[PDB]
From TrEMBL, chains A, B:
It comes from Serratia marcescens. Belongs to the class-A beta-lactamase family. One of its GO terms (biological process) is beta-lactam antibiotic catabolic process. This is Beta-lactamase. It catalyses: a beta-lactam + H2O = a substituted beta-amino acid. Residues 22-248 form the Beta-lactamase class A catalytic domain.
Amino acid sequence: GTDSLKNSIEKYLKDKKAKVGVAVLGIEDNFKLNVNEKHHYPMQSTYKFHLALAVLDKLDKENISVDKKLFVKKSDLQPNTWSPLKDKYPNGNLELSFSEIIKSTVSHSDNNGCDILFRFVGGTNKVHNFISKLGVKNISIKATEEEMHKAWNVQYTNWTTPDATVQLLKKFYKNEILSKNSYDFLLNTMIETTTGPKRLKGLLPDGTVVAHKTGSSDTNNKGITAATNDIGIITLPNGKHFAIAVYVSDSSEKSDVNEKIIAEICKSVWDYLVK
Amino acid sequence: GTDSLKNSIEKYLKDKKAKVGVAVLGIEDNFKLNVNEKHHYPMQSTYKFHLALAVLDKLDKENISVDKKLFVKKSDLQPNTWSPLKDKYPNGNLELSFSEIIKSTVSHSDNNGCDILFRFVGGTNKVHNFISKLGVKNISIKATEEEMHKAWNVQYTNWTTPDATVQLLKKFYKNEILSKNSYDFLLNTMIETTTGPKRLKGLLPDGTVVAHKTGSSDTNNKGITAATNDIGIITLPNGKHFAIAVYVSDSSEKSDVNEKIIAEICKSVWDYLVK
Ligand SMILES: *C(=O)N1C[C@H](NOS(=O)(=O)O)CC[C@H]1C(N)=O
Ligand SMILES: *C(=O)N1C[C@H](NOS(=O)(=O)O)CC[C@H]1C(N)=O
Ligand SMILES: [Cl-]
Ligand SMILES: [Cl-]
Ligand SMILES: [Cl-]
Ligand SMILES: [Cl-]
Ligand code: NA
Ligand code: NA
Ligand code: NA
Ligand code: NA
Ligand code: NA
Ligand code: NA
Ligand code: NA
Ligand code: NA
Ligand code: NA
Ligand code: NA
Ligand code: NA
Ligand code: NA
Ligand code: NA
Ligand code: NA
Ligand code: NA
Ligand code: NA
Ligand code: NA
Ligand code: NA
Ligand code: NA
Ligand code: NA
Ligand code: NA
Ligand code: NA
Ligand code: NA
Ligand code: NA
Ligand code: NA
Ligand code: NA
Ligand code: NA
Ligand code: NA
Ligand code: NA
Ligand code: NA
Ligand code: NA
Ligand code: NA
Ligand code: NA
Ligand code: NA
């Protein structure tokens, strides 16, 4: 049955000109599915989940309220990157709460908010170690968003296996990582995500709860899109949950196809688990 | 006097590690100042002005109302680029007016709106020719935003001299290019610009009217920022106007310094003209 679902996904992937990594882990039960999982996939913005974990842990441990505010300099809001915060606050030089910054960074994938938070938490190495020490191997966090935008290859240094991702998502969902309040906060923020609505969510019934974080790369001069990703936890019609991570990497396919790969793989998994 | 202002600007630029092109043209009088003007500077987002001219001309000539709507596909709203439209409409697949698209493209520098409009108007070559046929030489329009994001060098194909820019801005301000309504619309849209508030506007008195369009590049792995630009028309305290264009190119300086170069050069010009 699980083997059959796997074979269906593998057959779907046969004519897609991309390297697609898939992992699924049940939250409450023992369901497990991996496809192409031993490869290293570039995370792009999906690593803002990991960053948010480390940030909220730091706030939890050091007794810093999420309503406390950072001073966000104009130079912290750089122009040549995706940034709803910057368009909201074009002059910068203002106090913003950790709450507001994290919500933008995670739900709207702000790149400036990401790097502001890397600086707050003490750098990429802090977050890399934090994750490693949760007992999840096969995740590498090396470069900030600014660093990734400087050169095409730098994104591949921020890599993961897909099964690492869902292991981490399951530790998180069972609230094994954060305080209750920080867990509630991050989970709500992941359900509130507005990006990628035609990825994991794309072909699921209207109103399905999907707590998720997307990531995307650009396309290079050879027509390759390095990363089109979506990771999250999905609620089934009976209240149970599954963690799923899909990484469409090094793809020669157009963006509509890359998103559809995620949506169709997710639908296949959903259809199996509801049945 | 004008020669003295020039010498002041040249002296300011002596210790700045960037190639800075400057042009100023009075709108109503004969004032003219050029610095480093024979070089070719990468325009980045400043070419959305030129695009808007060609678009509004097309709408004017073909009797198409600016309130008419394009269908903006989800694939027209690409994720790895600066785009307030995309964050506003994450599902895309909706009807948006030319008005709304142009306001986002010009006032908020949306990159997706830019490329949607390049497609509407018939491509970069259409806009290149349109501009050339206004009688303004030394502007090259070759690449869309998507094309620029594929490779570092592509931005240099969209180049200008600074004096070309202010020649064009003056033709525009005197409403020699568009209908009255389209002129009014584009001018209002340029005053409504929210980007770059610490560039041309940075050191001018609060409330000074500055109709402008900014542009920025990223920084490469060698620490060079190709472009930090601002172009526009400024209203003096006595109602007269000047067109100014500043291109801080191939800069080893940090972003705060690059912006400050524009702000300080503009202030110098402002101080001269008010006196
Ligand atoms: C993250 O991968 N990025 C930030 C932003 N969001 O895109 S997302 O919708 O897939 O998370 C733009 C794309 C990408 C990047 N290029 O920085
Ligand atoms: C234009 O140069 N771009 C679009 C957007 N706006 O920046 S602006 O404020 O200088 O016009 C982001 C930067 C840039 C680009 N990299 O596309
Ligand atoms: Cl980006
Ligand atoms: Cl947790
Ligand atoms: Cl961009
Ligand atoms: Cl005009
Ligand atoms: Na594959
Ligand atoms: Na389960
Ligand atoms: Na693995
Ligand atoms: Na800002
Ligand atoms: Na706030
Ligand atoms: Na605030
Ligand atoms: Na937000
Ligand atoms: Na560190
Ligand atoms: Na690191
Ligand atoms: Na790890
Ligand atoms: Na990269
Ligand atoms: Na693993
Ligand atoms: Na969501
Ligand atoms: Na979503
Ligand atoms: Na989507
Ligand atoms: Na992508
Ligand atoms: Na591609
Ligand atoms: Na110079
Ligand atoms: Na004048
Ligand atoms: Na010249
Ligand atoms: Na969209
Ligand atoms: Na509209
Ligand atoms: Na509309
Ligand atoms: Na707008
Ligand atoms: Na053309
Ligand atoms: Na062209
Ligand atoms: Na020309
Ligand atoms: Na470029
Ligand atoms: Na010229
Ligand atoms: Na303005
Ligand atoms: Na402004
Ligand atoms: Na600014
Ligand atoms: Na710049
Ligand atoms: Na620089």
